[PDB]
């Protein structure tokens, strides 16, 4: 696996997957589970 607390997976308008941390307002391409 699950995302860590706070994180959500989304897709941009171009279709690229990204990850949002709703605690820090960080958006990144990298899966936080790989980090």
């Amino acid at each position: 696996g699950p995302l860590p607390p706070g994180w959500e997976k989304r897709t941009d308008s171009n279709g690229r997957v990204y990850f949002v941390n709703h605690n820090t307002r960080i958006t990144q391409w990298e899966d936080p589970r790989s980090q």
Binding site: D12, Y18, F19, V20, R25, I26, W29
Partner: peptide, 10 residues
């Protein structure tokens, strides 16, 4: 380059 800003996300 970078994904969308949070404030655009929401």
């Amino acid at each position: 380059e970078a994904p969308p800003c949070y404030m655009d996300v929401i």
